[PDB]
């Protein structure tokens, strides 16, 4: 088949869905029992069975899909915060690069789903690897999703104006990236510099 601009936007949107589920699971944002094991990208992953969250993510993912297609979304951020104070403790950032020319493409692009799938699987393994060094979240936390766009006027009303919600004193490590040939997704996670080691 190959890669079209719409095919790519679906891949990426869907990646974010699985990416978010894995963060919320691995970081204990929702209890581990509100998650279920499924097969995706050739491995076993955890996705929510919480009905509100399912609905919420379906809505986000459908919107990202639309924005990615139009090259209207540059950053997707998962902000993890102390439920009491609102202090940001951990902040996962995805940067999205777009080939705006892919709209002019007369053929799907040559990259095997397998190839893309190997890339995504590598990125997800990496996300899993973070449990082994991320500072413990030692208070109860919630999450929030932010996006960054250049096209502000066409953002649906349901999306509220926001700050970037940076951590004051942070450490950040770069994760692997993947590419469809049309969208490239860079990842990283930042977190508050620990009190002591």
């Amino acid at each position: 088949q190959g890669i079209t601009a719409r095919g790519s936007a679906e891949i990426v949107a869907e990646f974010f869905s699985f990416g978010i589920n894995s963060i919320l699971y691995q970081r204990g944002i929702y209890p581990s029992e509100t998650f279920t094991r499924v097969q995706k990208y050739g491995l076993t992953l955890l996705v929510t069975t919480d009905l509100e969250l399912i609905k919420y993510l379906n809505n986000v993912v459908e919107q990202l899909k639309d924005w990615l297609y139009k090259c209207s979304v540059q950053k997707l951020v998962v902000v993890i915060s102390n439920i009491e104070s609102g202090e940001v403790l951990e902040r996962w950032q995805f940067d999205i690069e777009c080939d705006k020319t892919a709209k002019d493409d007369s053929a799907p692009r040559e990259k095997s789903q397998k190839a893309i799938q190997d890339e995504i699987r590598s990125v997800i393994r990496q996300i899993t690897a973070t449990v082994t060094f991320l500072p413990l979240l030692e208070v109860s936390c919630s999450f929030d999703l932010l996006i960054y766009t250049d096209k502000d006027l066409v953002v649906p009303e349901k999306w509220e104006e926001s700050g970037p919600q940076f951590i004051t004193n942070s450490e950040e490590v770069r994760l692997r990236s993947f590419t469809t040939t049309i969208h490239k997704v860079n990842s990283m996670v930042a977190y508050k510099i620990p009190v002591n080691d």
Partner: protein, 188 residues
Amino acid sequence: CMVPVVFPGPVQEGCCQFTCELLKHIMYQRQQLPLPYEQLKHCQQALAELESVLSHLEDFFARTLVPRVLILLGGNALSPKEFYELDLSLLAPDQSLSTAACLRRLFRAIFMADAFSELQAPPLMGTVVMAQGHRNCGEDWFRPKLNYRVPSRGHKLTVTLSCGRPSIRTTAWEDYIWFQAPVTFKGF
């Protein structure tokens, strides 16, 4: 590739834990396990085999200092498809920093080195665990391998641990020999 971890202070039960968590991590990252070992702790046969290696590692570290560990996948011990080394020789044989804090320093270091970056999925493989220990330490499960030679192909990573100490003898690990798990851990 060669990964240093330099603990900002002096670091035994620790070293056993570095070794055991590293083993677990490798097993998952190289897809010998479908989910991290500890998520699996809540198909059950292969987990007992790993439990067994892990528990035997614990008895071995009770018996001797362990300067080097090798984790060898596929092929055989002398000729693996791939292998990982943990080099503990520079650690103190005063510690204020916890095991937890040390573990995350080690694991941050391996992550930042982009270890386990293979794109192609590998097959299920047999994993051999080896470690050096004193010739006289009394080990009865791991088997002595007086003629072992570290493999010259298949190297993936070495993690070298130190903690800012200066001068140990050129002949420090003299009476130390390779021991080798008598059982293989099989990917699933």
